[model samples]
Target: EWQENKSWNAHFTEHKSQGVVVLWNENKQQGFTNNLKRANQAFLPASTFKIPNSLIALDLGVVKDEHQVFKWDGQTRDIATWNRDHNLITAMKYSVVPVYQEFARQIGEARMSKMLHAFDYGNEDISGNVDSFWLDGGIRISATEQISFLRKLYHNKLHVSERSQRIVKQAMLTEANGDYIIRAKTGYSTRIEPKIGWWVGWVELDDNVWFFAMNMDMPTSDGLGLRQAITKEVLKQEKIIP
Candidate 1:
């Protein structure tokens, strides 16, 4: 059973809504949720979908490997970092939408849908546009679903090949300091009303791994970092990391 932590929900006092869920390989789960109902409600995955997408791309040979480069088409974007060439690693690091979009185009709707269904991904609904389904389209997953999916990836329990899983995990590496390696992805879905922000991933320590998913509605772009801020505070309180 999962424990509810109202104290942790206090971190979201300023927001209209927020929720966080954490799970460990040791068989424990906890959450800090303003609205428990909403926490279980599925929403568009935004860039957080990249994690599974990366696995799918690797498994299908859409991308030969993490080092394979997908050059930019020189299209001007709102984010400057996305305007240049990106390999799998850099693209994941930068959350380059175009690169993954191209990958999606190549993967096609048929194969994408097949894989999502096989993985039992949230709702398995890719009914909308292929290129942007996870952005503002039909692809939706709840915080609990995110953690469940992540737990599978962490244990290499997903149906994909081990090589594919290993490569995706490699690309997810975000920070490494001393004995701790934090691999995560941040997502912001501005296309949706109220705008949703996300921080989903795990921290690998010498002895255990701590996985987390945090998401909230943002009144404005300024609330972006609150996802990470709240998650980190909760992790500290749980003594999962220093």
Candidate 2:
């Protein structure tokens, strides 16, 4: 995709810590890597991990589609809670903790472990247990691994059944601009510590695909929300979708 962007160099100079940008060419087998050396490091994937959870649910037939409803338990009330009902996509869009916690409980650790292993692209220690704090509790995965797993989901290779894969892929793709599609998920954790922010998305350009995963760890004192801001910058600069 950068091949068509004359301003690519200028963009890279601005985001020094930005990681790898994977591009799949027209031949499918042909591909290229940029920023490989600087991009191999590991970091917490944040909410991007939710995509895998959704895939697991789809594979297990636990939920028929992204619209599958999970009622709010009102266990812990907050502004983000869906008072009466919540669906997978809505929970995902709002990044609801209670809904995801409920889903995690129902799916359990064993099943989640099995799916993660099958994806075979992350920290080996991730499990089903809900810990004391969201940020401190869950497992971690590198940007490279997150991108790989995301690709599998996009290509429908993670599902045991074709129908399941198709349904998931369709639900994920949303028109963010004129003719382009943006499929992504974001996550954050709050526990009286430095919060973690994440944004992972893939954009289709003609026969090519651009996938990126970003993580921002700001100072505990700043308490700034950088996920959405960074995401908007990425999309604007890439011009892949808007």
Clashes of each: 0, 1
List per-candidate RMSD values in Å. Answer: 2.0, 4.6
TM agreement with the true structure for every prediction: 0.92, 0.74
Model 2, 114-207: lDDT tens digits are 7668888577456435422134554666555667777787777874566666665565554456566677676564442344555666677666
Worst 10 residues of 1 by lDDT: 25-34
Q: Kindly list the per-residue Cα lDDT of model 1 for residues 1-242, writing each as its tens digit.
A: 55555677776774555665544444345444444666688888999989989999999999999888788898899999999999999998888999999899999999999999888899999978889999978888987788788888888999999999999999988889996788889898888775788888888888777777778877688878788887777787778777
Which runs of model 2 end up more than 4 angstroms from their true locations? 1-38, 127-134, 190-194, 220-225, 235-242
Best by lDDT: 1
Which pairs clash in the backbone of model 2?
Answer: 47-187
Report lDDT (Cα) of residue 43, candidate 1: 80
